[PDB]
Design an enzyme around this catalytic site. Sequence first.
Site, PDB file in Angstrom:
ATOM      1  CE  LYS A  39      -2.420   0.170   3.575  1.00 27.97           C
ATOM      2  NZ  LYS A  39      -1.980  -0.200   4.964  1.00 27.97           N
ATOM      3  CG  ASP A  67     -13.460   6.608  11.461  1.00 27.17           C
ATOM      4  OD1 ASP A  67     -13.238   7.278  12.497  1.00 27.17           O
ATOM      5  OD2 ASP A  67     -14.500   6.727  10.775  1.00 27.17           O
TER       6      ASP A  67
HETATM    7  N1  LIG Z   1      -7.036  -7.972  -2.373  1.00 28.29           N
HETATM    8  C1  LIG Z   1      -6.971  -7.138  -1.300  1.00 28.29           C
HETATM    9  N2  LIG Z   1      -7.629  -5.949  -1.349  1.00 28.29           N
HETATM   10  C2  LIG Z   1      -7.575  -5.087  -0.306  1.00 28.29           C
HETATM   11  C3  LIG Z   1      -6.843  -5.448   0.816  1.00 28.29           C
HETATM   12  N3  LIG Z   1      -6.940  -4.423   1.685  1.00 28.29           N
HETATM   13  C4  LIG Z   1      -7.720  -3.469   1.118  1.00 28.29           C
HETATM   14  N4  LIG Z   1      -8.112  -3.875  -0.095  1.00 28.29           N
HETATM   15  C5  LIG Z   1      -8.953  -3.132  -1.043  1.00 28.29           C
HETATM   16  O1  LIG Z   1      -8.145  -2.153  -1.676  1.00 28.29           O
HETATM   17  C6  LIG Z   1      -8.934  -0.959  -1.937  1.00 28.29           C
HETATM   18  C7  LIG Z   1      -8.260   0.229  -1.298  1.00 28.29           C
HETATM   19  O2  LIG Z   1      -7.654  -0.115  -0.057  1.00 28.29           O
HETATM   20  P1  LIG Z   1      -7.763   0.855   1.201  1.00 28.29           P
HETATM   21  O3  LIG Z   1      -8.334   2.188   0.762  1.00 28.29           O
HETATM   22  O4  LIG Z   1      -8.435   0.130   2.342  1.00 28.29           O
HETATM   23  O5  LIG Z   1      -6.295   0.986   1.531  1.00 28.29           O
HETATM   24  C8  LIG Z   1     -10.338  -1.258  -1.425  1.00 28.29           C
HETATM   25  O6  LIG Z   1     -11.127  -1.769  -2.495  1.00 28.29           O
HETATM   26  C9  LIG Z   1     -10.101  -2.362  -0.398  1.00 28.29           C
HETATM   27  O7  LIG Z   1     -11.220  -3.187  -0.163  1.00 28.29           O
HETATM   28  C10 LIG Z   1      -6.179  -6.673   0.840  1.00 28.29           C
HETATM   29  O8  LIG Z   1      -5.511  -7.020   1.846  1.00 28.29           O
HETATM   30  N5  LIG Z   1      -6.255  -7.493  -0.220  1.00 28.29           N
END
Ligand SMILES: Nc1nc2c(ncn2[C@@H]2O[C@H](COP(=O)(O)O)[C@@H](O)[C@H]2O)c(=O)[nH]1
Lengths: 304, 317
Positions: free
Chosen positions: B110, B237
């Site tokens: 991320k 949150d």
């Molecule tokens: N495949 C996968 N998708 C994730 C994971 N964590 C978050 N996401 C997805 O990635 C997108 C953005 O992540 P976020 O804004 O939570 O950092 C969202 O659609 C969320 O559901 C993960 O561990 N694995």
Amino acid sequence: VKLFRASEPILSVLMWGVNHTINELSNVPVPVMLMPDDFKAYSKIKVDNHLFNKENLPSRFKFKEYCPMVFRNLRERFGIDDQDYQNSVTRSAPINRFLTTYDRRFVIKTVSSEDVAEMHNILKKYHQFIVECHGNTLLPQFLGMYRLTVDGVETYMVVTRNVFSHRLTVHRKYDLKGSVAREASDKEKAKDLPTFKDNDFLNEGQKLHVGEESKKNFLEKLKRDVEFLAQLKIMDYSLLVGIHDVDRAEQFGPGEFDPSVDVYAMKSHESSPKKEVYFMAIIDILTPEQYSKRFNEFMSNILT
Amino acid sequence: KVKLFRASEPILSVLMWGVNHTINELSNVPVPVMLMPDDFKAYSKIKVDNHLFNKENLPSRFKFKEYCPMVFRNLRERFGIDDQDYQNSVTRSAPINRFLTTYDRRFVIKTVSSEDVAEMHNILKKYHQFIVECHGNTLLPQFLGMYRLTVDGVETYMVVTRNVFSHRLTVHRKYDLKGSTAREASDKEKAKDLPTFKDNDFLNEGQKLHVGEESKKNFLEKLKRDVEFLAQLKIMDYSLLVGIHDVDRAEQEEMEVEERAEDPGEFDPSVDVYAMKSHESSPKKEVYFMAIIDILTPVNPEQYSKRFNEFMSNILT
Ligand SMILES: Nc1nc2c(ncn2[C@@H]2O[C@H](COP(=O)(O)O)[C@@H](O)[C@H]2O)c(=O)[nH]1
Ligand SMILES: Nc1nc2c(ncn2[C@@H]2O[C@H](COP(=O)(O)O)[C@@H](O)[C@H]2O)c(=O)[nH]1
Ligand SMILES: Nc1nc2c(ncn2[C@@H]2O[C@H](COP(=O)(O)O)[C@@H](O)[C@H]2O)c(=O)[nH]1
Ligand SMILES: Nc1nc2c(ncn2[C@@H]2O[C@H](COP(=O)(O)O)[C@@H](O)[C@H]2O)c(=O)[nH]1
Ligand SMILES: Nc1nc2c(ncn2[C@@H]2O[C@H](COP(=O)(O)O)[C@@H](O)[C@H]2O)c(=O)[nH]1
């Protein structure tokens, strides 16, 4: 685990750097040929470690490798594998500026800024000569060249294949120029391993007996080499000669060596006198005709 | 064994290079008996300036910073992840999709803000201890590495976690659940192949997750101490990410992919760490992935944890 533990931080950084640059090169494809830019190229890495891995390495240092594609190709042409070179440098601290790797295979010389300039000056032609003579030369075999920055201070180093064996004890040495007249000073005569010069050698009447077999290759080598140096307009280089007396060492075989590793070694002839192993190469080439012909004649009058 | 760090962006090349470099360096650093306070303020930094050399995939000039590397090495070890595996997952081929996955889908990378890095530092000591005493058994994100890359004088922060989802099993429906008193998905999201549905979407569908009582109890005990832990810090949150894998639908999809190219539902609980099978008396065979996400960015923490908890507990049967 390589700790890079050494008597002095400069040595640690050297170990770390050879390790890092060799590993990094293992990811770089071997090119079809060297290009002009490879002779002006470098790698620089700067390290700033806060509260981490400070036990042997300093937190902050720089390591610069000059022309790594060129010296990697030179290692290949000298029959040296990159992993062995890396191993010789990093497995254990190099030892006693003038150093040797712990296994005595490689020499590490601290040099000046102008030495590094001069190396860049001859590197293309030197490389082309190494190509043309198929690695078969008495010139220094330049394996790598580095600049280390520790505690704000820059230190330049050039790595060569050791002239002497990494196994066989040298019992007396000579720095020969063919020149004038030069000898060993009373202060120099005191060390267990003394460096003798032309006149000491001549006045001693000591010859070297390699037969007419080794004499051929050797002289054929020496002339091509000095012709090359002269073509470069370089002088003040020497022939380093080392002598290992077999009986004395005796007092895993006597006089036994691997020629692919002790590249400069020559067996004493059978019909000759005492039993010895000789080691002979050209050193200190980083700085005309007269010099070359003279040096050549002087060294030619030493092999019977 | 040559590694080229070939990637579509210089950022990815540098990421692969930096993970490769830091892991190799860490292999030459013994494993301490314990961690020391300095390891929590520690970092490594490497600056590279190559001239006329090695420019095919890497930029000539870049920087790579690893935050608290001894700690993250240890966290990897407690999560049952070998350093060579992690390194190979990142470097054998380019991560894909800022939100990245490693090419084999085991790790998530991320892109975060500077503030997120700050908050990782604030919470790192307590997070580590909590990981120690819960033996790596947690629904919390499992943090494996934190980095800062510099390319073109621009800084990018990155945190690496274990994927909540399986690295092999396809996810067919996903929710992000908070337990807030209106949270739905836009008409835009709903038009994506895999929409991020939300609370009211979950509630309105009458969706349930049938895992059976032993799994449910284990899950709820984790959730409880996890959300208490988060409430203790400032944290609010965060979400429960929920993935649903339809076993039959996947079997069919596999068959169709074979038919195209020509011209279950089991899994390793030590790799797909968040995965639970449906109850042997479930309306259909499913696999679920459930974990807490977004704990960094931080109606108060206590309350939030209590609510979040109630809601998540009435999600499953
Ligand atoms: N495949 C996968 N998708 C994730 C994971 N964590 C978050 N996401 C997805 O990635 C997108 C953005 O992540 P976020 O804004 O939570 O950092 C969202 O659609 C969320 O559901 C993960 O561990 N694995
Ligand atoms: N063992 C060893 N000694 C060398 C080698 N080259 C030069 N030396 C010796 O090291 C000393 C210093 O070298 P210089 O100042 O010429 O670079 C001199 O005594 C010289 O003869 C070598 O390749 N191996
Ligand atoms: N760049 C940097 N920021 C720090 C460091 N320690 C704390 N901070 C940042 O300084 C702010 C206040 O930190 P505090 O000392 O109040 O916990 C926060 O934004 C925090 O992330 C540090 O060692 N380096
Ligand atoms: N608490 C804390 N925050 C840090 C530390 N190092 C960096 N930060 C925070 O992380 C962000 C980026 O730090 P940078 O590494 O770019 O200097 C900033 O918010 C900075 O304050 C640290 O050692 N401790
Ligand atoms: N549920 C289910 N659907 C199938 C099965 N075989 C084919 N279908 C569905 O029937 C349609 C035609 O499939 P096709 O046989 O042309 O691959 C597609 O929608 C496909 O997914 C099956 O065994 N089970």
